């Protein structure tokens, strides 16, 4: 080292960090296909790639979401649920009961921009008693998306988020409706 190196990129603006308008819970609740995964505390290893899964957002008549994440087995798909609830208004939600929770310190969720006919992007941020990690995902609320969406998800995140940490889309297809 000790020579010209790669520190060219300037401070990345929020341009990769927009937020959904006043979209409503009562119609937003649905089932997306997990299509990319990036965060500072996320483990993307070439040796051990992450299989993609699915998650369904189901609102309840009490400004709250019960979210079902679907996973793949060798020939079965199973369900597990986490809850999400809007903070004070639409656009901001939290997970669990971090106010009442012991080792959960601060869980805030804010989807960036959805395109429910193609794709949507999530900004997930949370802390445990003393751990700080955040994750951003892109998934497909439709049966199919675009083949450009692969390069486009990398190039958009790359231009704004460069290769800072574990920010990639190690998510193949393998939709569980085909199994």
Swiss-Prot record:
Gene Ontology biological process terms in this record: acute-phase response; cellular response to amyloid-beta; cellular response to hydrogen peroxide; cellular response to hypoxia; cellular response to increased oxygen levels; cellular response to interleukin-1; cellular response to interleukin-6; cellular response to lipopolysaccharide
Keywords annotated in UniProt: Apoptosis, Cytoplasmic vesicle, Disulfide bond, Glycoprotein, Immunity, Innate immunity, Ion transport, Iron, Iron transport, Pyrrolidone carboxylic acid, Secreted, Signal, Transport
In-chain residues carrying the UniProt-annotated modification Pyrrolidone carboxylic acid: 2
Main location: secreted
Cellular component aspect of the GO annotation: extracellular exosome; extracellular region; extracellular space; specific granule lumen
Pfam families with a match to the protein in the record: Lipocalin
Disulfide bonds: 77-176
Residues that bind enterobactin: 107, 135
Outcome after substituting residue 135 to A: Strongly reduced affinity for catecholate-type ferric siderophores
Subcellular location: Secreted; Cytoplasmic granule lumen; Cytoplasmic vesicle lumen
Residues where a carboxymycobactin binds: 53-55, 126, 135, 139
UniProt-recorded Gene Ontology molecular function terms: enterobactin binding; identical protein binding; iron ion binding; iron ion sequestering activity; protease binding
Glycosylation sites: 66
Tissues expressed in: Detected in neutrophils (at protein level). Expressed in bone marrow and in tissues that are prone to exposure to microorganism. High expression is found in bone marrow as well as in uterus, prostate, salivary gland, stomach, appendix, colon, trachea and lung. Expressed in the medullary tubules of the kidney. Not found in the small intestine or peripheral blood leukocytes.
Induction (record text): Expression is activated by the oncoprotein BCR-ABL; BCR-ABL misregulates expression via the JAK/STAT pathway and binding of STAT5A to the promoter. Induced by insulin.
Cited PANTHER family: LIPOCALIN (PTHR11430), NEUTROPHIL GELATINASE-ASSOCIATED LIPOCALIN (PTHR11430:SF13)
Protein family (similarity comment): Belongs to the calycin superfamily. Lipocalin family.
Entry function: Iron-trafficking protein involved in multiple processes such as apoptosis, innate immunity and renal development. Binds iron through association with 2,3-dihydroxybenzoic acid (2,3-DHBA), a siderophore that shares structural similarities with bacterial enterobactin, and delivers or removes iron from the cell, depending on the context. Iron-bound form (holo-24p3) is internalized following binding to the SLC22A17 (24p3R) receptor, leading to release of iron and subsequent increase of intracellular iron concentration.
Record text on subunit structure and interactions: Monomer. Homodimer; disulfide-linked. Heterodimer; disulfide-linked with MMP9.
Protein name per the record: Neutrophil gelatinase-associated lipocalin
Organism: Homo sapiens (Human)
């Amino acid at each position: 080292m000790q020579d010209s190196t790669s520190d060219l990129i300037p401070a990345p603006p929020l341009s990769k960090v927009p937020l959904q308008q006043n979209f409503q819970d009562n119609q937003f609740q649905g089932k997306w296909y997990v299509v990319g995964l990036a965060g500072n505390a996320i483990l993307r290893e070439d040796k051990d790639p992450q299989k993609m899964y699915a998650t369904i957002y189901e609102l309840k008549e009490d400004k709250s979401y019960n979210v079902t994440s679907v996973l793949f087995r060798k020939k079965k798909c199973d369900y597990w649920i986490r809850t999400f609830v809007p903070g004070c208004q639409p656009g901001e939600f939290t997970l669990g009961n971090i106010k009442s929770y012991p080792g959960l310190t601060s869980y805030l969720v804010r989807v960036v921009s959805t395109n429910y006919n193609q794709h949507a992007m999530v900004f997930f941020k949370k802390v445990s008693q003393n751990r700080e990690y955040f994750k951003i995902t892109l998934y497909g609320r439709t049966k199919e998306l675009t083949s450009e969406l692969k390069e486009n998800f990398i190039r958009f995140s790359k231009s704004l988020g460069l290769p800072e940490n574990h920010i990639v889309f190690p998510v193949p297809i393998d939709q569980c409706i085909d199994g």
